[PDB]
Design a protein around this ligand. Structure first.
Ligand SMILES: *[C@@H]1O[C@H](CO)[C@@H](O[C@@H]2O[C@H](CO)[C@@H](O[C@@H]3O[C@H](CO)[C@@H](O)[C@H](O)[C@@H]3O)[C@H](O)[C@H]2NC(C)=O)[C@H](O)[C@H]1NC(C)=O
Ligand SMILES: [Cl-]
Ligand SMILES: [Cl-]
Ligand SMILES: [Zn+2]
Length: 581
């Protein structure tokens, strides 16, 4: 009956708040202080939260969701029936929790050392080398070295991780873990929807690829770049070649129109990692959206500590399911790239504050992609020359194509990589890719989608996916692909609401209450309604669409077509078999 069902939801909500609150603190202390004490406290708080999940998930399965009128009640109960890892028998649950902890630690503490000297960490050392070095062999030292230490050591944990995470999914009614992850979007046509979105950005990516390949051919020499083959994976300014903005000096369309060194501008004018978040806080409030509580500033780790303690550096935002406690954990470097990431993480916090009045089971994004997109939308406005100049970090047709090129190196280059990652994982989860095919099938997709090849031939024992944070940390990736598509849809819609006329890329939504109002009401929905409703609240239409992204970059697509045609470039990589000598 309906009456017992709403009572159960109320009971679940109160008990979840307390137990979810306790787990968050226990997880925080490990993430901000990797030791042995905090690790086993987390392993024991894992059993406490699993008891709650098992207890209430059993009760939920005794409810026939099928016989329930109120859809909000119907929705929550259906979610509680999913136990996740808690569905596993005790021995396998503790094994699975240990493996995850082992993988997360292995990744976070891994270092790449010189013959008998300095040992380098991923952030900021190896990140800095990948971004600034222009020597082929030095970049290779960092690229290979990171994969030799982080990737290779993850390989031992991964098959059993796949086995146990799939087992949990089967016990919760799914065929495998990929199926379980995809269900978060509540869209039966998701795979075909994502494929069509990817195909629509092919002409824009292939033109950026061909142009960047030409620029690399210019600098690294004809012997190391094949203008009809895939680009060596280590030359794009980033460890995973997911974003390419750091090789801007190598690709700048009009060097005739030069732009400020934005990193040294920040360091000189006295930009603290604290001021970087303070300015991101200002942008949100200018839209009429909520400020971060005083408690946020007291308890957040906005900078890498000098204790000598190990930490999880990857940027993340933290909801304590309290309605009062919200935190950010980030190893912030003072540069433009981390200012964007600071806005991204503040977007998560805003989403937390907007739906804190909802039940905890519904305290979630419309879909995971929505949660990632909020900060990135504001960052698009922050990234404009007009907003950056007003922050004294910069000082028109040539500057216009340059800016669009800068944005393309991040936004466009990430489309194929963000698509790639879960294309690999889903096939790993469903059995298409086994442990003897992990690395081979990873590079097949690197070639197929990104048009990248490894700089060094891959050997047995290589597990390059393990050198990317999200893989050993078991964090789904397709969200970022959705985010990059939809953030431009949000941008377009918020700019038309702001009354911005002219080219989309010159829009700055700063201080627009109309743009804030559309964001607010959509975020307030949380996970109460299917995402097409939240999409419609912001954009006036319910579909994911690549139109807004192509509109934004339309001036660049025309310029690239002309430029690549006059060089007689071949779009794509007809010689997919090509690897370096
Ligand atoms: C199914 O059950 C759900 C949850 O019990 C009902 O949703 C609730 O609906 C009421 C309005 O009927 C919402 O109350 C509102 O609160 C705000 C306070 O900020 C106030 O300004 C409004 O005037 C209103 O009173 C309440 O938020 C909402 N709760 C949730 C969790 O969504 C729903 O009405 C039920 N559906 C049917 C068809 O009976
Ligand atoms: Cl890789
Ligand atoms: Cl996701
Ligand atoms: Zn995020």
């Amino acid at each position: 009956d309906e009456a017992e069902a709403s009572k159960f939801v109320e009971e679940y909500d109160r008990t979840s708040q307390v137990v979810w609150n306790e787990y968050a603190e226990a997880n925080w202390n490990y993430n901000t202080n990797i030791t042995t004490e905090t690790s086993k406290i987390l392993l024991q708080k894992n059993m406490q939260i699993a008891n709650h999940t098992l207890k209430y998930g059993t009760q939920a399965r005794k409810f026939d969701v099928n016989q329930l009128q109120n859809t909000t009640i119907k929705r929550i109960i259906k979610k509680v029936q999913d136990l996740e890892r808690a569905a596993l028998p005790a021995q396998e649950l503790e094994e699975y929790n240990k493996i995850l902890l082992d993988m997360e630690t292995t990744y976070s503490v891994a270092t790449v050392c010189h013959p008998n000297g300095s040992c380098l960490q991923l952030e900021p050392d190896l990140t800095n080398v990948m971004a600034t070095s222009r020597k082929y062999e030095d970049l290779l030292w960092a690229w290979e070295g990171w994969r030799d230490k982080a990737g290779r050591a993850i390989l031992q944990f991964y098959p059993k991780y796949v086995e146990l995470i799939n087992q949990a999914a089967r016990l919760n009614g799914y065929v495998d873990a990929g199926d379980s992850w995809r269900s978060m979007y509540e869209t039966p046509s998701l795979e075909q929807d994502l494929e069509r979105l990817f195909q629509e950005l092919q002409p824009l990516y292939l033109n950026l690829h061909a142009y960047v390949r030409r620029a690399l051919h210019r600098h690294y020499g004809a012997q190391h770049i094949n203008l009809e083959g895939p680009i060596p994976a280590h030359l794009l300014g980033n460890m995973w070649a997911q974003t390419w903005s750091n090789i801007y000096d190598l690709v700048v369309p009009f060097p005739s129109a030069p732009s400020m060194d934005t990193t040294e501008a920040m360091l000189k004018q006295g930009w603290t990692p604290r001021r970087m978040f303070k300015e991101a806080d200002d942008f949100f409030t200018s839209l009429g959206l909520l400020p971060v509580p005083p408690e946020f500033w007291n308890k957040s780790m906005l900078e890498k500590p000098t204790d000598g303690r190990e930490v999880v550096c990857h940027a993340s935002a933290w909801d304590f399911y309290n309605g009062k406690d919200f935190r950010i954990k980030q190893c912030t470097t003072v540069n433009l790239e981390d200012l964007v990431v600071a806005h991204h993480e503040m977007g998560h916090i805003q989403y937390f504050m907007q739906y804190k009045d909802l039940p905890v089971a519904l305290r979630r994004g419309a879909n995971p992609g929505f949660h990632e997109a909020i900060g990135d939308v504001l960052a698009l406005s922050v990234s404009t020359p007009k907003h950056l100049h007003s922050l004294n970090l910069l000082s028109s047709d040539e500057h216009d194509i340059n800016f669009l090129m800068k944005m393309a190196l991040d936004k466009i280059a990430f489309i194929p990589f963000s698509y790639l990652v879960d294309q690999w994982r889903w096939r790993v989860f469903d059995g298409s890719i086994t442990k003897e095919n992990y690395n081979q099938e990873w590079w097949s997709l690197r070639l197929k989608y990104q048009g990248l090849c490894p700089p060094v031939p891959r050997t047995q024992g290589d597990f390059d996916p393990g050198a990317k944070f999200h893989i050993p940390s078991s964090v789904p990736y397709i969200r970022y692909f959705v985010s990059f598509i939809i953030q431009f849809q949000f941008h377009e819609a918020l700019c038309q609401a702001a009354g911005h006329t002219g080219p989309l890329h010159k829009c700055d939504i700063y201080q627009s209450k109309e743009a804030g109002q559309r964001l607010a009401t959509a975020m307030k929905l949380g996970f109460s309604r299917p995402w097409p409703e939240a999409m419609q609240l912001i954009t006036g239409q319910p579909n994911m669409s690549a139109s807004a992204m192509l509109s934004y970059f339309k001036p660049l697509l025309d310029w690239l077509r002309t430029e690549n045609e006059l060089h007689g470039e071949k779009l794509g990589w007809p010689q997919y078999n090509w690897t370096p000598n």
